[PDB]
Amino acid sequence: SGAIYVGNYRVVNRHLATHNDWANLVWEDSSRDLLVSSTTAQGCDTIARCDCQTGVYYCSSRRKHYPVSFSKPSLIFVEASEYYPARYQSHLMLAVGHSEPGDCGGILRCQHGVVGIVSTGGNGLVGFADVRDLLWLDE
Numbered sequence: 332s333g334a335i336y337v338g339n340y341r342v343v344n345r346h347l348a349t350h351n352d353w354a355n356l357v358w359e360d361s362s363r364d365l366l367v368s369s370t371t372a373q374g375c376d377t378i379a380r381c382d383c384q385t386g387v388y389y390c391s392s393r394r395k396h397y398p399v400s401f402s403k404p405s406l407i408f409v410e411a412s413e414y415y416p417a418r419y420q421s422h423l424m425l426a427v428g429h430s431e432p433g434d435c436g437g438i439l440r441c442q443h444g445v446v447g448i449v450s451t452g453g454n455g456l457v458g459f460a461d462v463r464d465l466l467w468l469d470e
């Protein structure tokens with residue numbers, strides 16, 4: 332579980348979006364596993380606008396934050412699940428680290444702010460759905 336709250340926007344993993352998120356949909360992308368819904372309260376998370384490839388992520392299955400080196404946002408194949416068929420997920424960044432079902436939503440951050448959220452895992456690898464290109468989240 333986990334979301335990014337910036338301005339009047341809530342950012343979640345699309346496969347974990349609620350009825351309220353869908354009834355207040357702003358934008359969603361199946362290929363990215365992202366969904367943005369509108370909120371009443373004003374969020375204060377800062378979104379990073381950079382090309383940082385090092386940062387720290389929250390791993391709820393360990394109740395710990397871990398420093399990681401991570402790859403550039405790209406199209407990476409993701410195995411079938413009860414949420415999606417086997418496909419290439421776009422804007423995905425991988426790191427060597429622990430992630431298991433339940434860790435989706437954990438925020439990845441660099442010194443500039445929020446980079447993205449945990450979206451894939453397994454095999455000693457963790458996948459993060461990048462949000463740094465969504466410039467509209469700020470305005």
Ligand SMILES: C[C@@H](C(=O)N1CCC[C@H](C(N)=O)C1)c1cccs1
Pocket residue numbers: 346364409412414415420430431432433434435450451452453
């Ligand atoms: C099962 C596995 C995974 O990569 N999934 C399942 C949840 C949906 C993911 C996706 N982004 O399409 C794929 C996970 C381990 C840890 C977090 S999510």
Ligand SMILES: [Zn+2]
Pocket residue numbers: 379380381382383441442443444
């Ligand atoms: Zn950065």
